[PDB]
Design an enzyme around this catalytic site. Sequence first.
Site, PDB file in Angstrom:
ATOM      1  N   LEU A 117       0.464  -1.204   0.107  1.00 48.88           N
ATOM      2  CA  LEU A 117      -0.198  -0.282   0.019  1.00 48.88           C
ATOM      3  C   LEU A 117       0.696   1.377   0.051  1.00 48.88           C
ATOM      4  O   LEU A 117       0.857   2.380  -0.918  1.00 48.88           O
ATOM      5  CB  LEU A 117      -1.084  -0.343   1.042  1.00 48.88           C
ATOM      6  CG  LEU A 117      -1.627  -0.969   0.939  1.00 48.88           C
ATOM      7  CD1 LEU A 117      -2.546  -1.119   2.778  1.00 48.88           C
ATOM      8  CD2 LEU A 117      -2.947  -1.039  -0.124  1.00 48.88           C
TER       9      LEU A 117
ATOM     10  N   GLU B 261       3.342   1.746  -1.510  1.00 46.11           N
ATOM     11  CA  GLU B 261       4.654   2.045  -3.332  1.00 46.11           C
ATOM     12  C   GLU B 261       3.461   2.803  -3.657  1.00 46.11           C
ATOM     13  O   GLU B 261       4.138   3.396  -4.723  1.00 46.11           O
ATOM     14  CB  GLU B 261       5.182   0.885  -3.290  1.00 46.11           C
ATOM     15  CG  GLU B 261       6.079   0.034  -3.156  1.00 46.11           C
ATOM     16  CD  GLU B 261       6.122  -1.202  -3.117  1.00 46.11           C
ATOM     17  OE1 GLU B 261       7.630  -1.791  -3.865  1.00 46.11           O
ATOM     18  OE2 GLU B 261       6.075  -2.071  -4.829  1.00 46.11           O
TER      19      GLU B 261
END
Lengths: 427, 146, 436, 436
Positions: D252, D254
């Site tokens: 998440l 990233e």
Amino acid sequence: MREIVHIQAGQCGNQIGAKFWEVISDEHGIDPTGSYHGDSDLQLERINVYYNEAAGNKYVPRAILVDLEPGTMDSVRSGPFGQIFRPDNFVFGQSGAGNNWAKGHYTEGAELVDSVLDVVRKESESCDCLQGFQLTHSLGGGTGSGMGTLLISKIREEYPDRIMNTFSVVPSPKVSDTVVEPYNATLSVHQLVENTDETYCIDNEALYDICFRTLKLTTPTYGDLNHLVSATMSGVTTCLRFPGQLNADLRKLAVNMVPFPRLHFFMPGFAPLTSRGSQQYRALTVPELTQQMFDAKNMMAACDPRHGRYLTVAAVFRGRMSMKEVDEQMLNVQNKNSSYFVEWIPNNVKTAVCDIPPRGLKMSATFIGNSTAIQELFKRISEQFTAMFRRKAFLHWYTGEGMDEMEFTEAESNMNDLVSEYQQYQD
Amino acid sequence: KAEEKEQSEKLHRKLQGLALVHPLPDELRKLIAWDMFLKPNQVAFVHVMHYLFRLLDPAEFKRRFFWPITDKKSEANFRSSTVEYLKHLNEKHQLHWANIKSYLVVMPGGMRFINFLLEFVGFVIQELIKQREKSLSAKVMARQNA
Amino acid sequence: MRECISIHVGQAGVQIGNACWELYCLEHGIQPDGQMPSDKTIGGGDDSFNTFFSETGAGKHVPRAVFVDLEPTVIDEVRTGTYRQLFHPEQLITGKEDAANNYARGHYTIGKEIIDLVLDRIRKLADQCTGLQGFSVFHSFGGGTGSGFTSLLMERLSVDYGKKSKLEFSIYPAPQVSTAVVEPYNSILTTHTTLEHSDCAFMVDNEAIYDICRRNLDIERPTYTNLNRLIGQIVSSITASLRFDGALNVDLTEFQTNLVPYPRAHFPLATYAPVISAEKAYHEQLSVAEITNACFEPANQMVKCDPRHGKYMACCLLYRGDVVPKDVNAAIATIKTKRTIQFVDWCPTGFKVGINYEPPTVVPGGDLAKVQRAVCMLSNTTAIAEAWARLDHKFDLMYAKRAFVHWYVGEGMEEGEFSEAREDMAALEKDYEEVG
Amino acid sequence: MRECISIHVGQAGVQIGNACWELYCLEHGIQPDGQMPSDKTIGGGDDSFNTFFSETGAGKHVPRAVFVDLEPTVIDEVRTGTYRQLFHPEQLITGKEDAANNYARGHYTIGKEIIDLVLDRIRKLADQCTGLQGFSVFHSFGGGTGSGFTSLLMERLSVDYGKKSKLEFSIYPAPQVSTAVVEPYNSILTTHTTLEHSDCAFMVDNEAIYDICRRNLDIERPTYTNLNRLIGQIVSSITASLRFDGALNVDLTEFQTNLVPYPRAHFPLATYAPVISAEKAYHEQLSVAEITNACFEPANQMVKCDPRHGKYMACCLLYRGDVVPKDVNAAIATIKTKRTIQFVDWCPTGFKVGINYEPPTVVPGGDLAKVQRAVCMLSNTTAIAEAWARLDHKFDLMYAKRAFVHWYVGEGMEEGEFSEAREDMAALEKDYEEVG
């Protein structure tokens, strides 16, 4: 075993007593011949409380029928269950009491009392462990009032350790036979205060107003009033007659219901209210039963429970119901209305459930309240008494039997002392 | 409207006079005005009746009424009991009050209500007079006392 | 052998006893006639169940039990029920007249007429024991037989058997299920008189059991049958170390030694997990960590109190079924880091851990699901004094006006015994405060 | 492990959630009872799907999901539908009374009665996670529960879980499918209150989905079932990097790092290709170059705007199925030479490329054809501000006359909160203009 001896005295006592026996014989599966034809072992498990076993598996009521005239007792013997009673237990006079307490207590009843006590002794000697006595009578008449209290006092002399319970019909001007009913009632209330452990106050005013206003009977008869009384008596006696979580006896009931020895006058109630021959097709819910049993309109004493406080309460539910729902509804009534219960008696509301409903209902609730509001019934009798007594009206009927006016002044004062004692614990 | 005003003022005077003998509770003291029943005023009604009933018979009031009023249900009960008690009084004392109906208690206000209340207050005052007579100019008394 | 005699006193004791013995028969594979068909050992197999059963010469296993009530009603249900053949008729003792919700009638009046018969029947069972450990007494605080007859029995057992341990399973009264107003008096009077005679007493608050049945079993209005089935699982989890081969609490004296640091503070708080409805039996099985964490939730306790307001003197974790010691130690380490668990300074911050590999059994057609693993936490905590303070407050309110006292004095009890019992309860509350 | 909890709020969130979880079960080979028969690994196989599922001790895979609605109606359809056995009953939370299309009723009145129950259920799922990454919240901007309860939930999640990423999937209201007049107010109020709590929010314009269903699926009048099936494919393509082994957007954090250069500009435009009717399933399969070129056509976007009127701050291409990196690079080079793709000057003109070899699955009997390859383009572009300006204009028209404001003030909301929320939206429009 745990036996009870039943006594029924005078016209009203024998009529209500006969209806009580008809109702409970049917709940126990006993026919008018004394033979058992039930379908459940629970009907026989505690039958010995009210019945003696006789030769040929017959059940005979432990009942003693008392009157100063034969007319009511011949009517009982000709009645639907008139043949179930032991013939030797019909003890009667010929002269009658003429609605006079002095005749019942000092004269006509004092000639017959020893013959009644001989039958009481014969029934008591046949018990394995006698719990006590129950009396059905009216306080307005001569025989039930005067001879009934003489019998209570004599039973307490011979059996001082045994419980004495009464189903006492209180007179009202709405359902009155004679103007002297307040005199008979005041003289009898004084004897009940000293000589009973439990007195169910059954007010003819409340019974009439239930029949008229709630049951919509335009012209209630004594047969409609006695239907309500017999249903209430069945309700109250359910924990004695059937197995349950409370293996009740009369002494356990008295010890739980009577905080003070003089304050043993109970307000009985019943839910749902039914009329004779009217089938209720809709069973009530547990919340509807609990709300009705605490409604003043379902009380058989014409007092408002909101004008006083409950010292103690017993609630008997009958029929197949959720015992959890019963406790939740009983706690809901207490928590919402906590001001109407005394705080200095913790957990003063007791609840019992029996799986066996009364005939024609799927579920019922019977209420027994020891409330300070019962003082309203005694105040109402006191006012009617004093209204005549201040003029010495009708006293010649009692002084002709040998009563002094001082006995009336003592009974009036003892009844006012009882009202003051109820007021003390209300405040 | 003129007659209604006059009667309302008369009512106010009588209530003020009563307050001199029997002080008004704090709640009622704030509500008391000469025009308090020209429009329907449920709140004033409840407190005025409460005050008058207590003056008349505190014991009977305690028996018939629950006080203070805490909810809608209790309020409805107070109205019903008020009608019942008034009927009882009408019969007992033969006051010949006409049409002691539910409307006096549902929308207390207007000429009809003011007239009724005036009669009732009059009755209460008469009862108090009797009591005082049994037990027993303002300027002259005042000077003499001083 | 290391035999235990169970004694079930009054309606509550008898009805809980009946539910416990049904569950013991199911767990040991004993039929309602007392036959054990898997017992190929005509002689000494896993002799652990002989702690609670006696083998008769007909291969019938009979409970080492006595049932006592002052009325016949509740014991006649045992004589006519499914397990009517399990018990010997001499073990089922009934009076004629009850105690009518009065301690004094149960202790002084009616109790005195039946006590010598009860002691003779207990002696006949003790004479059949090679090495009697002690007694497990089941009763109610609120009811007249459960209070008054139990105190008289506990005194007489201390005289006849003064080196034998006495464990109690006592039902604490709850307003919602309460039959008498005088239940606070009966409770204070019996607790006072039994305090010097008990070695360890497991209190069960009817309000706690009722709320667990409502919340966890979705039963809108629990009956005594629902309550007693849950109580039977807790009692079974406590006695499982005496009935099966196991490493912890293998005798009655080990309970006192592990749970009771002070003789008066002998009331361990029981907590049981998991409690799951039979309809949810096919749901995901709870992990060791989840069931151990549920033991520190006040919603699962057997007495309504909050252990976060007090201290722990002792803590025992009794696991049943598929449980490995590694996962228990990992669960305890996670709980010690996340929970407010205050122990008293003088006692080691030690959990005693028992694991019995025998899975929990449930009554067929009962409200409880079959679970792969369960835990009973027994903790001696000062927060249990919150239950005494609630009882004492109700006692004081009625006693300040002498309400109902005349019923006890009418049975020949002195009014001074109420003041003495209340003073001893005030001393017990102070003992718990001084430790906390 | 790297677990994610999905939260589905109100009718729109619940119905999209139900379509997404059906598709996830089909993609992972999980049956509607939660059984996985290809899973020969009784233990840790390709552990990537354990991000969204929890294995129970019965071999049943349960979604890491919570469903919340203030009325029972939509969740009772989930409790009775095909996947009724997939979810645990505790994950399906229902109120009694709805928010009646009012943000204030959903936030202040009814939302406050249910919020602590929802947080307890979310906590029970978080406690089952070894390494919770974050939350994925599904809701509508226009509906009272989807707006008001989601803002209250996002605030409380930021308090309890302030280091855990929060992703939103937000349904932007469309006139043609709109149930309320006050949808602009609910949308501005919720966007204001969620702006500081969201890390990345995927807007889905109901008008865009409706037009794609009409044009590409030949459906004359799309239902919510048709819209939610298409939304489920886009959501599945976004979450595919978290559910399967892959090289791009594996957490998440990233997503935020690759798509969100400025904390307030956290609304990536999604574009999905190809969308083909099931009747056309036997047609010629689209090349990598054709599907990548379809990502730069406004007709295939999830929000109605024109990226040719703005700039790109970030661009991610997520491919699924039969795709080789060589053909992707050749497609991107052809697109850079033929299309008006203006990036902002300070950001590299770089496409991030993810390829997952798992082909797109479609619901059996759905409107969508089975395709060999698909692409989801996620682009942060300033042209998404055209959707804010359309909402703000409708807000301003009604608010200039205080139309409907009394319904919000009647729930105890201050009139000042409308002005504050509108001022924050004017600041957001300006932030997008200054970057563009």
